Amino acid sequence: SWEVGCGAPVPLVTCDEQSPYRTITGDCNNRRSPALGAANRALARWLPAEYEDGLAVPFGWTQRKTRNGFRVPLAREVSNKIVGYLDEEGVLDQNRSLLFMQWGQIVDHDLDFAPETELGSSEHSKVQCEEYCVQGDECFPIMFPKNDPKLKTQGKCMPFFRAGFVCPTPPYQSLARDQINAVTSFLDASLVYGSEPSLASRLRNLSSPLGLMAVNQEAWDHGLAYPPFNNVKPSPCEFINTTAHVPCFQAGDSRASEQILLATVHTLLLREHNRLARELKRLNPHWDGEMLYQEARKILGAFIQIITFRDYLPIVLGSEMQKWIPPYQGYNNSVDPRISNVFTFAFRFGHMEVPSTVSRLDENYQPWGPEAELPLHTLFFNTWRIIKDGGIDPLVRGLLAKNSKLMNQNKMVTSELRNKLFQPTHKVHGFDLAAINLQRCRDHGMPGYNSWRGFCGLSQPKTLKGLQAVLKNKVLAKKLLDLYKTPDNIDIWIGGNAEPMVERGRVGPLLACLLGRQFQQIRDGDRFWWENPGVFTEKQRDSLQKVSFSRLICDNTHITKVPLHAFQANNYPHDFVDCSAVDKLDLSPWASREN
Numbered sequence: 309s310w311e312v313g314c315g316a317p318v319p320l321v322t323c324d325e326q327s328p329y330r331t332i333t334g335d336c337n338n339r340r341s342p343a344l345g346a347a348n349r350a351l352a353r354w355l356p357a358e359y360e361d362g363l364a365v366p367f368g369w370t371q372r373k374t375r376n377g378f379r380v381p382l383a384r385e386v387s388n389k390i391v392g393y394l395d396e397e398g399v400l401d402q403n404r405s406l407l408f409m410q411w412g413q414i415v416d417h418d419l420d421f422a423p424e425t426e427l428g429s430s431e432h433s434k435v436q437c438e439e440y441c442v443q444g445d446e447c448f449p450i451m452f453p454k455n456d457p458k459l460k461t462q463g464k465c466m467p468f469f470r471a472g473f474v475c476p477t478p479p480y481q482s483l484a485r486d487q488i489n490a491v492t493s494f495l496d497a498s499l500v501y502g503s504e505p506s507l508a509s510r511l512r513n514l515s516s517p518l519g520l521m522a523v524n525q526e527a528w529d530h531g532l533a534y535p536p537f538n539n540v541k542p543s544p545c546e547f548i549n550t551t552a553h554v555p556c557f558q559a560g561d562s563r564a565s566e567q568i569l570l571a572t573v574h575t576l577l578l579r580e581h582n583r584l585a586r587e588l589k590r591l592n593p594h595w596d597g598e599m600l601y602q603e604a605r606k607i608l609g610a611f612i613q614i615i616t617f618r619d620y621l622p623i624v625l626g627s628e629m630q631k632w633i634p635p636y637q638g639y640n641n642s643v644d645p646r647i648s649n650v651f652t653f654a655f656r657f658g659h660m661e662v663p664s665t666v667s668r669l670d671e672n673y674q675p676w677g678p679e680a681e682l683p684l685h686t687l688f689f690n691t692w693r694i695i696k697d698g699g700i701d702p703l704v705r706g707l708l709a710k711n712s713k714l715m716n717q718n719k720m721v722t723s724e725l726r727n728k729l730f731q732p733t734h735k736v737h738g739f740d741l742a743a744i745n746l747q748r749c750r751d752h753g754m755p756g757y758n759s760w761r762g763f764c765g766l767s768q769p770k771t772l773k774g775l776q777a778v779l780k781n782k783v784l785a786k787k788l789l790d791l792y793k794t795p796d797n798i799d800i801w802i803g804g805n806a807e808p809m810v811e812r813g814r815v816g817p818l819l820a821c822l823l824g825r826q827f828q829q830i831r832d833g834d835r836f837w838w839e840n841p842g843v844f845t846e847k848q849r850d851s852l853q854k855v856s857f858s859r860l861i862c863d864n865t866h867i868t869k870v871p872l873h874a875f876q877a878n879n880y881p882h883d884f885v886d887c888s889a890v891d892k893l894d895l896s897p898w899a900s901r902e903n
């Protein structure tokens with residue numbers, strides 16, 4: 309033990325018996341072990357952590373040390389040589405709408421957040437890290453390799469602060485550092501409601517006994533709601549356009565405004581909660597504020613689970629869907645529902661599905677205005693383009709008619725993210741998400757590519773020849789071994805994303821395993837899974853089955869034409885139908901009378 313204060317939240321709870329509703333923090337879901345899956349606990353470790361000193365020091369930290377006898381390559385060099393490309397022509401996913409990417413980021417934020425330590429760090433530390441690229445304490449800077457273009461405009465590095473972690477306590481026993489998951493591991497709409505109780509309360513409209521969530525009082529979108537503003541100064545969302553000075557949104561998850569289409573989906577989900585609460589208050593005039601809130605919350609939660617498991621995962625996992633996630637057989641309280649540390653890297657496959665632009669489309673799905681198509685980089689922490697420039701309807705139409713990027717082994721991450729990322733505590737559109745992901749793997753003590761291959765029962769290549777065969781690409785394998793020297797040292801994020809995709813899915817074998825396992829567990833280990841007998845009545849369940857993303861849009865925007873299968877690539881007008889053609893959520897089963 310030395311004595312640097314760590315990241316530190318506030319854990320466990322005492323358990324209501326027949327509460328038919330989730331706690332906010334996720335506690336008491338598992339009765340035998342009530343903190344399992346709760347927020348602000350350690351990410352689970354499926355494998356032992358791998359640090360330079362076995363405890364906390366990341367691989368890459370110390371210069372004359374090695375990982376299995378080789379130096380680990382600079383995160384930014386990997387990014388440049390393997391992950392980058394110039395030509396966007398032909399990169400789109402011909403069979404996935406942009407909503408596919410976007411629903412992923414949504415589900416990811418419901419499940420995991422490992423907070424970082426920059427905001428809470430001293431000004432000195434921040435300056436040493438950004439200004440001077442000085443490694444030490446929480447600063448683990450991402451150094452530019454020789455010849456990096458950014459040497460000519462941004463100095464020697466990008467600053468990077470280590471993830472928060474669970475505090476060494478008595479007994480004091482030497483144990484490897486564990487990063488925190490600040491949200492609930494359950495797929496439970498925590499990104500709307502919050503994972504912490506004072507936040508959840510602040511988000512609620514407690515001024516009326518109508519169980520509503522609070523909405524913005526300064527702006528509306530053709531009469532429809534926006535989230536409240538987060539009214540701190542300073543705000544990154546204000547920083548990117550001080551003349552507009554439109555703050556970030558306040559939602560159940562703090563990342564909600566990181567980009568405009570994420571904020572768009574958060575907005576839809578919030579609108580849907582209030583829609584539900586109003587429809588239930590009509591059906592059950594006697595229900596009080598709490599009951600309306602909880603019951604709406606419970607339905608929104610189920611909506612997320614259904615869209616995720618029925619529509620989304622089958623198109624991520626393809627032929628592996630059934631293998632990892634066989635038909636449900638009910639709650640198993642021996643299942644660990646916690647999100648693993650590795651899954652928080654595995655689920656960043658999403659970063660390769662994000663295209664270089666976002667479009668606003670009018671009601672004929674044609675470009676909306678003279679600035680119809682926007683570069684992605686201008687949309688990070690951007691709420692003013694929503695509030696001052698058309699609201700969400702034109703963005704929602706783009707979600708449906710435009711495509712996700714397709715992961716490609718020589719076009720991995722768009723430069724909008726690999727060179728122009730804006731980070732909320734800094735001032736430049738010049739960060740590299742890919743480098744940051746790699747650096748972060750090391751921060752979190754990730755075992756390497758082959759450790760995970762073996763965990764998943766997959767071959768572990770050792771030579772160029774073996775790696776070529778796994779990746780079905782000789783050049784990519786060559787470039788990886790020139791950088792990493794042994795496949796054992798390949799960082800999980802890039803190794804997993806390098807593998808060719810499984811049939812009918814959008815990830816390879818390794819990722820299919822890590823993701824498939826996790827999703828199996830968050831379903832099987834959740835007492836309030838929507839299909840678990842007793843959570844919903846059977847009539848409630850038969851209604852829920854009809855939910856769709858298209859109907860969510862129909863109900864919470866003024867978009868009047870939608871496809872049936874919103875995750876598929878769909879072209880207007882041939883694939884689009886009027887909203888009367890889309891099933892509704894029939895709420896009569898929630899009719900609670902006295903007799």
Ligand code: HEM
Nearest residue numbers: 409412413416420421422567652655656658659662744748
């Ligand atoms: C424009 C789109 C996106 C942006 C700008 C974005 C940005 C970021 C940023 C800045 C981080 C934090 C990186 C770090 O410090 O380690 C991150 C993490 C993450 N991203 Fe994304 N990302 C996007 C899309 C997606 C998508 C589509 C997925 C999944 C399908 C996703 C999944 C994640 C996950 C799992 C994490 C780790 C979260 C945690 O547990 O802390 N991202 N992304």
Ligand SMILES: *[C@@H]1O[C@H](CO)[C@@H](O)[C@H](O)[C@H]1NC(C)=O
Nearest residue numbers: 402403404623873875876877
């Ligand atoms: C696109 O994928 C979906 C799976 O949702 C499939 O039903 C559809 O027919 C596919 N079409 C093509 C050309 O890949």
Ligand SMILES: *[C@@H]1O[C@H](CO)[C@@H](O)[C@H](O)[C@H]1NC(C)=O
Nearest residue numbers: 513515516518520521522523
């Ligand atoms: C709370 O609800 C009332 C209607 O009961 C509405 O007039 C008011 O604006 C709401 N407040 C917020 C913050 O949403």
Ligand SMILES: *[C@@H]1O[C@H](CO)[C@@H](O)[C@H](O)[C@H]1NC(C)=O
Nearest residue numbers: 548549550551552553692696
């Ligand atoms: C900033 O926003 C203002 C006011 O909303 C808008 O008129 C202007 O074009 C924006 N400028 C930039 C540089 O984004």
Ligand SMILES: *[C@@H]1O[C@H](CO)[C@@H](O)[C@H](O)[C@H]1NC(C)=O
Nearest residue numbers: 637639640641642643644832
């Ligand atoms: C619950 O989980 C464990 C571990 O996966 C397993 O051995 C056991 O079969 C499961 N229980 C039931 C009733 O399926």
Ligand SMILES: [Ca+2]
Nearest residue numbers: 418492494498
């Ligand atoms: Ca959650």
